[PDB]
RNA sequence: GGUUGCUCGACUGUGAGCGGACCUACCCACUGUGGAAACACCACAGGAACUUCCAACCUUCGGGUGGCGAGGUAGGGCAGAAGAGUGACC
């Protein structure tokens, strides 16, 4: 049979400088062959704990695991921003190995409103036939926001994407990127476009907007 | 110090076909050190495929590539191979190498790993990106970028003035067009005066169609 | 013929609590640690404990020394000896 590593949470806030407990319980008795391993966005994993206890060459002192029986927990006495990352627990005891399913890490600072930006679609684009709009909300916390495009004020539904960047460490704070997409026809039919965001530091849902042709 | 490791044949493959992903080890023999290779299927968690042990060559695997795969090393080449076989659409991932750690310095810990080949698997066919031109606000500080829109498959580069201008980007990540296909946008920030006199060029990239674009960011044109 | 000593000896034995520790070579194993080493390979330490034993050595004859994988094969050690001699004695 396989041992199982059951990890979490499976996502974690919390401010800068608090204690953070992760931890993780093997379906069966896998000794101290127990690793925890940090993993930032777009990089590869490092390792931090090997034996269940063993602070690895460079990890710094706030890192530290514990065994007690079939649970182990990494321990950050106080959170730096950098400590933004994906954590894995990793038993090497048994064959096959087997990694927690990884518990997400936030950073968390005061509340910064989101920057807003509106794009009209480019010229080489609605010469393609395409049309995106693009509303951009830079560099704002927390990452909860509400983002509406009303065309000719009419509120649309299921023609925008957005996605989000991760928290950038230093900044401790997130962008966002919506998109609305049109036909050039269905484009061609309206003259308002407009973004309307509504975020905790806003006291007022902010809109950008632009009309159709204005230089 | 020198310990590296260098993957590589990971890409875009029908289902039902065949890859072998190799690993370079630079900073290190590998005759002494056990290798393994761990998975991630994007935005998913890390996953172990297969290990091959030092002395021995005893092989081991993943219950989910049993028979699929097969690990193994040239010690000549100072290389691991994986040859994986019959693939399907969930071994979508990109495929890390990893350095099992001397036992006196690091346990049975992985204390060097690769930055990961990613295999891709699906049917339909590559194609590049359109890139559009996110021109800033004609009204200190606006936002100019880059539209990197509808290709396929996983990953563009987006880089600024050819990586001179790194301060205020946002490349965000990709998203998965209904249409298949990966759009993403890139925006940065610059203060509003540098517009007039300011070249402002991305630079996009997307190695699996051989495509690069190079699209020069000026204001609105009236 | 008896009694027995003496020497060759077929063969068998090496006996486990109310009671088994002989040696050597190879093989086959088990456990730990170490070898850049999760299995495989190698080296090395070690076979629950309390006992029991001296096939081995030394002895001032008081005692001491050294010694355990109930594995396989085998060459011997030590114990009886079927039998062959062969004496003293009746």
């Known amino acids: 049979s396989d041992i199982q590593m059951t990890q979490s949470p499976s996502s974690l806030s919390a401010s800068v400088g608090d204690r953070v407990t992760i931890t993780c319980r093997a379906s069966?008795?896998?000794?101290?062959?127990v690793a925890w391993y940090q993993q930032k966005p777009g990089k590869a994993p490092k390792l931090l704990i090997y034996?269940?206890?063993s602070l690895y060459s460079g990890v710094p002192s706030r890192f530290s695991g514990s065994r007690s029986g079939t649970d182990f927990t990494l321990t950050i006495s106080s959170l730096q921003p950098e400590d933004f990352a994906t954590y894995y627990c990793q038993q090497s005891y048994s064959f096959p190995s087997t990694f927690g399913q990884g518990t997400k890490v936030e950073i968390k600072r005061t509340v910064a409103a989101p920057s807003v930006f509106i794009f009209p679609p480019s010229d080489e684009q609605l010469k393609s036939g395409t049309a995106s709009v693009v509303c951009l909300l830079n560099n704002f916390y927390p990452r909860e926001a509400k983002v509406q495009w009303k065309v000719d004020n009419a509120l649309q539904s299921g023609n925008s994407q957005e996605s989000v960047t991760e928290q950038d460490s230093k900044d401790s704070t997130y962008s966002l990127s919506s998109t609305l997409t049109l036909s050039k026809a269905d484009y061609e039919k309206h003259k308002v476009y407009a973004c309307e965001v509504t975020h905790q530091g806003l006291s007022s849902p902010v809109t950008k907007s632009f009309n159709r042709g204005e230089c | 110090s020198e310990v590296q490791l260098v993957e590589s044949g990971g890409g875009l493959v029908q289902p039902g076909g065949s890859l072998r992903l190799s690993c370079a080890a630079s900073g290190f023999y590998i005759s002494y050190s056990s290798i393994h290779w761990v998975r991630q299927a994007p935005g998913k968690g890390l996953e172990w495929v297969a290990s091959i042990s030092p002395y021995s060559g005893s092989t081991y695997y993943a219950d989910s590539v049993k028979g699929r795969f097969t690990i193994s090393a040239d010690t000549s080449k100072n290389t691991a191979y994986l040859q994986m076989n019959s693939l399907r659409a969930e071994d979508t991932a990109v495929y890390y190498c990893?350095?099992?750690?001397?036992?006196?310095?690091?346990?049975?810990?992985?204390?060097?790993w690769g930055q990961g080949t990613l295999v891709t698997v699906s049917s339909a066919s590559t194609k590049g990106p359109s890139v559009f031109p996110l021109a800033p606000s004609s009204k200190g500080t606006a936002a100019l970028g880059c539209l990197v829109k509808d290709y396929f498959p996983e990953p563009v580069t987006v880089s600024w003035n050819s990586g001179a201008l790194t301060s205020g980007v946002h490349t965000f990540p990709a998203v998965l067009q209904s249409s298949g296909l990966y759009s993403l946008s890139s925006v940065v920030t610059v203060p509003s005066s540098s517009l007039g006199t300011q070249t402002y060029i991305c630079n996009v990239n997307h190695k699996p169609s051989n495509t690069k674009v190079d699209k020069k960011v000026e204001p609105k044109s009236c």
């Open positions: 069966q008795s896998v000794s101290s062959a």
């Open positions: 990893a350095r099992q750690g001397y036992r006196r310095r690091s346990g049975r810990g992985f204390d060097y």
């Open positions: 034996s269940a206890s």
